[PDB]
Design a binder for this molecule. Sequence first.
Ligand SMILES: [K+]
Ligand SMILES: [K+]
Ligand SMILES: [K+]
Ligand SMILES: [K+]
Ligand SMILES: [K+]
Ligand SMILES: [K+]
Ligand SMILES: [K+]
Ligand SMILES: [K+]
Ligand SMILES: [K+]
Ligand SMILES: [K+]
Ligand SMILES: [K+]
Ligand SMILES: [K+]
Ligand SMILES: [Mg+2]
Ligand SMILES: [Mg+2]
Ligand SMILES: [Mg+2]
Ligand SMILES: [Mg+2]
Ligand SMILES: [Mg+2]
Ligand SMILES: [Mg+2]
Ligand SMILES: [Mg+2]
Ligand SMILES: [Mg+2]
Ligand SMILES: [Mg+2]
Ligand SMILES: [Mg+2]
Ligand SMILES: [Mg+2]
Ligand SMILES: [Mg+2]
Ligand SMILES: [Mg+2]
Ligand SMILES: [Mg+2]
Ligand SMILES: [Mg+2]
Ligand SMILES: [Mg+2]
Ligand SMILES: [Mg+2]
Ligand SMILES: [Mg+2]
Lengths: 259, 141, 145
Amino acid sequence: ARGLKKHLKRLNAPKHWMLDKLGGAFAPKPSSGPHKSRECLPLIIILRNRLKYALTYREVISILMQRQVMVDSKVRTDKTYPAGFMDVVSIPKTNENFRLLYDTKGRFRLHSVRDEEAKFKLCKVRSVQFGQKGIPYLNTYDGRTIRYPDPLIKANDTIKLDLESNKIVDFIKFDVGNVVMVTGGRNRGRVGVIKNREKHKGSFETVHIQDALGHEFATRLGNVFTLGKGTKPWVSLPKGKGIKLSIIEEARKRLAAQS
Amino acid sequence: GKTRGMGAGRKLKSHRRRQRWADKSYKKSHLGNEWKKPFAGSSHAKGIVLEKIGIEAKQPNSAIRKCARVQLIKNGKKIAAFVPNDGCLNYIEENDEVLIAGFGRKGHAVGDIPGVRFKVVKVSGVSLLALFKEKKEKPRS
Amino acid sequence: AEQTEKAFLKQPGVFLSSKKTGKGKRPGKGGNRYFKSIGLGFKTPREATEGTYIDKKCPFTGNVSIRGRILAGTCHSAKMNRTIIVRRNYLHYVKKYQRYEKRHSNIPAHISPCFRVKEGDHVIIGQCRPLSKTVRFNVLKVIPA
RNA sequence: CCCGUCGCUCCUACCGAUUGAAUGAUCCGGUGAAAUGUUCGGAUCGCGCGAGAAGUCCAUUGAACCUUAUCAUUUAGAGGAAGGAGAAGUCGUAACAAGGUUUCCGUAGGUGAACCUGCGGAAGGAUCAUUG
RNA sequence: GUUACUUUGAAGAAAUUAGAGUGCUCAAAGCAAGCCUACGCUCUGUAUACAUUAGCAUGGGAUAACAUUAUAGGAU
RNA sequence: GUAGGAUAGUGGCCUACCAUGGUGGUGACGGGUGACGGAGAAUUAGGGUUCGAUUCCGGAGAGGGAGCCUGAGAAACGGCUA
RNA sequence: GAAACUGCGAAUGGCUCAUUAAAUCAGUUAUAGUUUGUUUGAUGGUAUCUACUACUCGGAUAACCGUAGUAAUUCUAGAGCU
Ligand SMILES: [K+]
Ligand SMILES: [K+]
Ligand SMILES: [K+]
Ligand SMILES: [K+]
Ligand SMILES: [K+]
Ligand SMILES: [K+]
Ligand SMILES: [K+]
Ligand SMILES: [K+]
Ligand SMILES: [K+]
Ligand SMILES: [K+]
Ligand SMILES: [K+]
Ligand SMILES: [K+]
Ligand SMILES: [Mg+2]
Ligand SMILES: [Mg+2]
Ligand SMILES: [Mg+2]
Ligand SMILES: [Mg+2]
Ligand SMILES: [Mg+2]
Ligand SMILES: [Mg+2]
Ligand SMILES: [Mg+2]
Ligand SMILES: [Mg+2]
Ligand SMILES: [Mg+2]
Ligand SMILES: [Mg+2]
Ligand SMILES: [Mg+2]
Ligand SMILES: [Mg+2]
Ligand SMILES: [Mg+2]
Ligand SMILES: [Mg+2]
Ligand SMILES: [Mg+2]
Ligand SMILES: [Mg+2]
Ligand SMILES: [Mg+2]
Ligand SMILES: [Mg+2]
């Protein structure tokens, strides 16, 4: 190519969007934004495919251009706006507040939240460094930059951010014994407590996580998001509480429900 | 005996590669000579009828097998093509346009006809089968 | 001593004609020779800390950082100026015959003057940015053998 | 039952004068559009200044062409010489029996053709055998 | 001293293949859809597996390969 | 290899000087391909064999070369210059 | 509100497989070796200093209008505005 690609073929869309194979030749290409294209959920999918408020692309645009949808307390009129992990989606007209979280199967789920819970969100810190004039600052994995951060905060920690004031109200250090959710890989959407951390010089760090039922799994450091201090998450989890159920037990539950 | 060393994979591969050329079928499809043959790797070829020829049948049979000398349009090569069915040579004329197919044995003579590897399928855009059964009529011009 | 070129060779950023003295100054400060540790558990040779050679491509005293792949091999050739050929020997699996064949790779690598290498000894090379047409690796350790 | 020359028809390639031909890619040397940079230049335009076209100078990239040579893929050719196939051709009878001179291998020579002969060799011999 | 080898883990686009669910009238398919007609509900579903070699991390130390041994210039 | 130039930047990418180096029967170099590569397709004891121009990913081209303006991005051709 | 100036886009998409045999390409790496319109989050303190508009600087040009050239082209020259 001679420059940036503006189209996304439907087969090339991320699988967790769950787009029909014969729905069309194209999928909504995520716009530039706080979240990466492969790790986002465009507002068009949320409003049309998931919530079914809009029956078409045109209806999605019509709904959004009325300034009726807010992301992180800010009105967004971009259909392909990348809304990702921990983001808050609010529709004041319908009195609906949603938080984007990964289900046990690794797909974004619109988790309904209370009004109080909709006033804050969690962020993961990438690094802390000095800006111009020697002013310290940190940036999160959702594109945010915060100046004069708490000196105790460091990379890979989780900060509680108040959307109304855009200030850090609390933070969690990345350490063993903290409940976390996996945001990538085959174990995406699972929730557990860190057991130990393996660090290799000049290589990715491995994190070992134990599920509430005792199941053990490991993942990379960049795929681990801390949800609270100790074993109690700071936000409400979706249905299933990040517990991955084997296909056999899922089938047993389905058959039991059938009768 | 065969070589069996665990570090002797290269020799086994090379020996098989060299010995594959002794296989006639492998050599035919890997020497790149199909493009110098009259059909040049095609199932069919069109040509112009030059002359009707009778070919004596091979022993122990005795017959005159009717064939046509055809020049292929795409490369100008001249071949002998058998004209099947009774009295079907009467539907062929000099300077006629004929479609030629293989004789079924992949470039080899068939039956008691010596040195003939092709047959006529169509004449003047009409299949010989239709002409034999009177389903169609040969175009006048 | 090492001024064998048409230009004066010196460590960049190391001021020499200072009115003060580098008594308690760190390496590279106060005119003291600059050196650094490359990490990954590798030890800085004692010949680079107290040497006088100037080599901008030296991992420990130059302007090249080590990142990427760390490879081991045997010194195949040491005829170039500050460059050696490292021969890496490995086995390639031949799937159809379930066997292996011998194979080798020649890897040009920069060798700092702090190392003494000879054709036939084991070396460890770290990856760095392109240094020449074919050189992308820096000698980090030598086993005399 | 069987071998070859010779005689007829057809088919396939091979050699070949023609200092053969075409195309593609590299090699030697030469010319070299256009553009870019540089030197000079100053139609002209605004307030002694600023901007500035045509043109010109030397370089860089370099198409295109010419010369030399080498590879790759095709292709014409008077004529020559091979092989094969084809119901009922001519001359012999070389191989099959000890095939009527056992056969055959290598080498050399010679005869219309099969073939003959010399030297050494093999049994795939027509002898597994003379302490007779 | 250096490797081969084996175990385990991460990560490893979709589509295609295998495969769970689902009466497009059946089927090839598709990713639908089901209860009841509640001004609704099922947080509806849209699983899971596979993936040579080479690379990364981990446990083992049998079978193998390369290097070394005594002019002590050896170990402490 | 040293010092420069150029580049968005590393690099014989280019220039000056210096050294004689670099690859190769573990097949270099040269030639052929009716050779774009892959995800994949056909057939299926197992091992294998054959195919992959074509809707997904990556690359290249716009009759053949070359040069270039605009621009964040092109050596663009439904842009320009030879 | 036509027209026109200004801004942006036209480097995406579609098509094809000619060239290309460690090359493209696959898996796996690196940029501490660079550029990146845009989106998202943060961040902008000294200009006149003796001229001395900042309650706001100056000169043009399109559309328009009217004199046209050429066989001819979103070929093209003057003139009057804003
Ligand atoms: K006959
Ligand atoms: K008969
Ligand atoms: K005889
Ligand atoms: K005999
Ligand atoms: K005679
Ligand atoms: K550079
Ligand atoms: K250099
Ligand atoms: K290619
Ligand atoms: K632009
Ligand atoms: K415009
Ligand atoms: K543009
Ligand atoms: K790759
Ligand atoms: Mg394109
Ligand atoms: Mg006889
Ligand atoms: Mg006789
Ligand atoms: Mg005899
Ligand atoms: Mg340089
Ligand atoms: Mg292909
Ligand atoms: Mg082709
Ligand atoms: Mg097509
Ligand atoms: Mg494509
Ligand atoms: Mg192009
Ligand atoms: Mg054309
Ligand atoms: Mg052209
Ligand atoms: Mg072009
Ligand atoms: Mg066109
Ligand atoms: Mg185009
Ligand atoms: Mg091709
Ligand atoms: Mg490579
Ligand atoms: Mg940017």
